[PDB]
Write a protein that holds these residues in place. Structure first.
Motif, short mmCIF file in Angstrom:
data_model
loop_
_atom_site.label_atom_id
_atom_site.label_comp_id
_atom_site.label_asym_id
_atom_site.label_seq_id
_atom_site.Cartn_x
_atom_site.Cartn_y
_atom_site.Cartn_z
N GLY A 77 0.70 -1.10 0.06
CA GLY A 77 0.22 -0.04 0.02
C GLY A 77 0.89 1.36 0.05
N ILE A 78 2.01 1.32 0.53
CA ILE A 78 2.88 2.35 0.75
C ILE A 78 3.35 2.59 -1.01
CG2 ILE A 78 5.20 3.18 1.31
CD1 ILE A 78 4.37 2.40 4.30
N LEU A 79 3.83 1.54 -1.35
CA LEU A 79 4.73 1.59 -2.46
C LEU A 79 3.56 2.06 -3.94
CD1 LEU A 79 6.91 -1.29 -2.07
CD2 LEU A 79 7.51 1.08 -1.87
N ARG A 80 2.24 1.75 -3.73
CA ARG A 80 1.29 1.94 -4.52
C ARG A 80 0.57 3.36 -4.45
NH1 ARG A 80 -2.81 -0.59 -3.40
NH2 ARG A 80 -2.09 -2.23 -2.22
N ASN A 81 1.04 3.92 -3.44
CA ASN A 81 0.48 5.15 -3.40
C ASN A 81 1.31 6.32 -3.78
OD1 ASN A 81 -0.15 7.58 -1.51
ND2 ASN A 81 -2.17 6.57 -0.96
N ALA A 82 0.85 7.41 -4.44
CA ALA A 82 1.48 8.39 -5.30
C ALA A 82 2.12 9.37 -4.23
CB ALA A 82 0.77 9.03 -6.06
N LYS A 83 1.30 9.63 -2.97
CA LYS A 83 2.06 10.53 -1.93
C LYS A 83 2.63 10.00 -1.23
CE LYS A 83 -1.61 12.53 -3.93
NZ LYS A 83 -2.78 13.21 -3.16
N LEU A 84 2.61 8.74 -0.96
CA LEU A 84 3.50 7.84 0.24
C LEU A 84 4.64 7.43 -0.27
CD1 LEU A 84 0.82 6.15 2.21
CD2 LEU A 84 1.74 8.32 2.68
N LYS A 85 4.64 6.93 -1.47
CA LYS A 85 6.05 6.22 -2.04
C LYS A 85 7.20 7.11 -2.23
CE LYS A 85 7.83 3.59 -5.94
NZ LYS A 85 8.33 4.38 -6.52
N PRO A 86 6.78 8.41 -2.69
CA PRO A 86 8.14 9.36 -2.78
C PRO A 86 8.81 9.81 -1.24
CG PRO A 86 6.32 10.21 -3.81
CD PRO A 86 5.98 9.09 -3.47
N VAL A 87 8.03 9.70 -0.35
CA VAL A 87 8.37 10.07 1.05
C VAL A 87 9.35 8.50 1.26
CG1 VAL A 87 7.76 10.49 3.54
CG2 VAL A 87 6.39 11.22 1.39
N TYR A 88 8.64 7.58 1.43
CA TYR A 88 9.23 6.39 1.73
C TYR A 88 10.49 6.04 1.20
CZ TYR A 88 9.07 1.33 2.68
OH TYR A 88 9.48 0.02 3.42
N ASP A 89 10.68 6.24 -0.30
CA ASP A 89 12.00 6.04 -1.00
C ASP A 89 13.02 7.06 -0.42
OD1 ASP A 89 10.95 4.02 -2.58
OD2 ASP A 89 10.64 5.44 -4.32
N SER A 90 12.64 8.17 0.03
CA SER A 90 13.52 9.07 0.57
C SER A 90 14.38 8.71 1.86
CB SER A 90 13.06 10.54 0.60
OG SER A 90 11.98 10.87 1.67
N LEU A 91 13.54 7.81 2.79
CA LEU A 91 13.85 7.62 4.05
C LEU A 91 14.89 6.55 4.27
CD1 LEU A 91 10.24 7.55 5.72
CD2 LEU A 91 11.82 9.50 5.99
N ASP A 92 15.68 6.47 5.39
CA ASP A 92 16.53 5.70 5.67
C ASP A 92 15.78 4.32 6.30
OD1 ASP A 92 16.31 7.67 7.87
OD2 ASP A 92 16.55 6.10 8.97
N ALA A 93 16.47 3.25 6.73
CA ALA A 93 15.86 1.85 6.95
C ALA A 93 14.70 2.08 8.38
CB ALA A 93 16.71 0.67 7.06
N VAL A 94 15.36 2.86 9.43
CA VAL A 94 14.61 2.67 10.62
C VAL A 94 13.66 3.52 10.55
CG1 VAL A 94 14.90 3.55 12.95
CG2 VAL A 94 16.89 2.58 11.78
#
Ligand SMILES: [Cl-]
Ligand SMILES: [Cl-]
Length: 162
Positions: A77-94
């Protein structure tokens, strides 16, 4: 520490249908069954989720199977979401783990409503995102859990959970 251990701490494990902090029928490791007030409606969602006649009780293995499915569905759900995915990809693992924790709790629609926090997380303005995240119903309803997740986003460590 990892997302599975983090969520097990925040959510607990119960082998019998229970009402979550919102009053919703839940079982296992924070697996929401239904928002409907009907316990019969919850039991029937449970039988369907597990594939047998549960009578409202499940085993540890079954609780862990639901859990695995839910973590997986939160990630996807994070990866398919246009708003969440860019944020998620930018973050470190923790801090990726903190994002999954929030989505698991409140659904992708809910988190995607944290527009200003999301923008600050993306810009890596950690202290400011922490302040903005705290101004939310989420923080006021479940402050202990919210602080743990906010601290994780602020610091990039598992310290709130150790
Ligand atoms: Cl299910
Ligand atoms: Cl809490």
């Amino acid at each position: 520490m990892n997302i599975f251990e983090m969520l097990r701490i925040d959510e607990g494990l119960r082998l019998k249908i229970y009402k979550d902090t919102e009053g919703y029928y839940t079982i296992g490791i924070g697996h929401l069954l239904t928002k409907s007030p009907s316990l019969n409606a919850a039991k029937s969602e449970l039988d369907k989720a597990i594939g047998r006649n549960t009578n409202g009780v499940i085993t540890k293995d079954e609780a862990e199977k639901l859990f695995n499915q839910d973590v997986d569905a939160a990630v996807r759900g994070i990866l398919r979401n246009a708003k969440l995915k860019p944020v998620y990809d930018s973050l470190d693992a923790v801090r990726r783990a903190a994002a999954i924790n929030m989505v698991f709790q409140m659904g992708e629609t809910g988190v995607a409503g944290f527009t200003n926090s999301l923008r600050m997380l993306q810009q890596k303005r950690w202290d400011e995102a922490a302040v903005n995240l705290a101004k939310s119903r989420w923080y006021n309803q479940t402050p202990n859990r919210a602080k743990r997740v906010i601290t994780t986003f602020r610091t990039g460590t598992w310290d709130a959970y150790k």
